[PDB]
Design a protein around this ligand. Sequence first.
Ligand SMILES: Cc1ncc(COP(=O)(O)O)c(C=O)c1O
Ligand SMILES: Cc1ncc(COP(=O)(O)O)c(C=O)c1O
Lengths: 434, 434
Amino acid sequence: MLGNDTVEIKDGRFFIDGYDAIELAEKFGTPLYVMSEEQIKINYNRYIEAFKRWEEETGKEFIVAYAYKANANLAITRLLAKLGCGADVVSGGELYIAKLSNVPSKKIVFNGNCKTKEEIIMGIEANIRAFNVDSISELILINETAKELGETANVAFRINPNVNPKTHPKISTGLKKNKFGLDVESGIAMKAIKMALEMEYVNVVGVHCHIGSQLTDISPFIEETRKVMDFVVELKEEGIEIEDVNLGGGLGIPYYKDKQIPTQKDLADAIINTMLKYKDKVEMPNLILEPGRSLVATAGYLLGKVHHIKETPVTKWVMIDAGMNDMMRPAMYEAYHHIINCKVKNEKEVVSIAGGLCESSDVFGRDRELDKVEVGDVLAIFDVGAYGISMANNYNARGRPRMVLTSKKGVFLIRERETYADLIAKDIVPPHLL
Amino acid sequence: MLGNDTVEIKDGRFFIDGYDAIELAEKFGTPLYVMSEEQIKINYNRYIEAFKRWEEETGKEFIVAYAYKANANLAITRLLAKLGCGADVVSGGELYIAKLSNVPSKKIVFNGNCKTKEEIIMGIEANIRAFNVDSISELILINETAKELGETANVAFRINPNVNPKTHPKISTGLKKNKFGLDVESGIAMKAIKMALEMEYVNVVGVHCHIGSQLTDISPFIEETRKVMDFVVELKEEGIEIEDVNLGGGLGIPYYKDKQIPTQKDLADAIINTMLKYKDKVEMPNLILEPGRSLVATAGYLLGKVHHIKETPVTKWVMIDAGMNDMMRPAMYEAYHHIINCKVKNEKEVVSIAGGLCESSDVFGRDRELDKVEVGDVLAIFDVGAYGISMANNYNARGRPRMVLTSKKGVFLIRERETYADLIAKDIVPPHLL
Ligand SMILES: Cc1ncc(COP(=O)(O)O)c(C=O)c1O
Ligand SMILES: Cc1ncc(COP(=O)(O)O)c(C=O)c1O
């Protein structure tokens, strides 16, 4: 139950925000994503409560730029906008959704290693807080585009800080070998920022860093914060001031329910106490974080009805109508999600749970102890609010599923499912093939 | 160039079916999927040519049931139907497309480990050649559903033959621990078939087996055939005859261009020579194969325009507008696809090629030697006709790409691209979030 603050078992049945899950499966059909509006408010409020100390002590702003890549469903993004949340967008599509969700432009940052001219025009016209520049090539394109529109673009720089490889080898290897960011150690990040200060159509406003995802140790974050701030000091020695420090996202969520993991409070104690060590060398900046998974993952549950039970010599398989095309995490990363029967039974058994796609990897969990499974039961797969519907697809010609939002106001359909007609709605047969 | 029979380098430029690739990219936009109609015809003809001896020597039919999971774009499936090809479908969605494509029901087989009652009603009403039964639970549902419709359903049985785990360890493991099929060793397959023989609304027509994918060694197929036929004998001894033997799909294609791999002829020799050895124990049946990848993979090319070149201490990156959401194989399986610049250059360099998504795994190839890359150049990613568009998605809020079909009749848009409005076309904002 760790992290799933709004669900419960009442009278032998599973509930989400007070709504009977099996009844939700019955009214809306399966497979079905259920997103808890209150759980999202709780996750968001944990960040605000944990980090308000930043504004209290420095007088600067603290901004949560929700990472849209985790779930950009329009109702979810409008909910987050209404809570006062910002947006971390990585494409023109996400920027479009953020603006249609009414997220204030000064709370929008644009990340990405292949920003196109059209996307840059869009960000400049929307006057986003900043493009987090990934390369010198991007900086040049932004300054040239800003010049064409007769405007000045705000630019922050995504840097790859000099993380201690002895203490954090995996983080370090990622920063050096992946496609993102401006290497600090080799001098690239300083070269890019000095180039931008000589350009006439960009305005230098910050540095950004994002080190990884599903990190359940506070250590990598402390090291990221130290090395990012060390670079802010290096910039200050060159006479360069930084208005914003954006430390990215990556806080892990409790997929496994048996062990405690670091919370937003732990993250803030770590970040804030580290950044304040530098207050006599540089002015404290506005602080931005880009949580994705840690705002929405625990708010999502995927319900799948059992259509077949199959005993084999090695395992008892339970086949459900949810599948890897609906939620790709287990098939793609062999990632663990907690799974239960929505109905409490007086018998338990160990089974493996699979969807119906042709892919051997279309298995949601193996050797799981669940209350006795019968055809017609509804299973709930926990913690699918992030990289769930956002990576869903039509593999095996299956429509993407419906999604509902459970709220104190009622249960609302927030994503309609796709029909067989939708599967071919972008296909066009040429005359000689009619 | 192995496998890519219809492309060429002419006058320093890449051509697909005689159409200049950079010009296709300029006319239709990038990222762009290009499917070669002639390459599909060539691949299909190789199967028909290779297996013609089956009907010559046995008087029985050889049927190609194209695996729709590889690519079910409506123009592609209508092309295969016009060629006389059958269909291996795994969902109601694929059956739907097959029937709208005019594939005759007599050449349609339905695979899947979680067939729903709704899907079974469709296959029965369409009078498909066979449901490849995956479990006893499915058999029971098929019989009950047929009774309710007043119809008789045709059933084959997907079995897991007694493959030799000493000689084929990887193959034997999958067959035992994977979620598919009826185990032969344990007596489950025989029990399922004898059960069907007693049911009033099902008609027993064959046995099916599918061992894996991208197999570039004939050995596993010989083992598969031998063990499937051994079970056919065991059935004969029980007084049970088998009309169809379907050996699945899985022949590998040449992703790497440096080494020769088994062709359809090699597969036919192994399979037909192995099956004929049973001619004195059982009557030869119709033979069905379910190739997917080997029919369409080499006919598809993905063109991506280069927007940025990025030098870093570890590698020189070329950023293109094709991404993992357009084609997931490199990101999901770290699979290799041949990649070239569409313009021949007087100089080559080693570069890594990535899309623009904010996922570290969104990289198409590393340390590849390409003709000198410049911004604006178009790269071609080979062999994406299978598990390419069929696994495409909207991750990072990116629309799925356009796809064109190059033909002797002209170049036709067979898949329109998704606009920003399409990204949110299934999302619904609840009243209190308006
Ligand atoms: C630059 C950037 N910021 C933030 C995130 C959000 O990560 P998480 O969902 O792990 O918090 C990502 C994930 O890709 C990212 O790439
Ligand atoms: C039963 C079945 N037949 C055929 C195929 C096609 O395989 P390939 O594309 O490797 O030929 C698949 C792929 O999952 C399959 O599951």
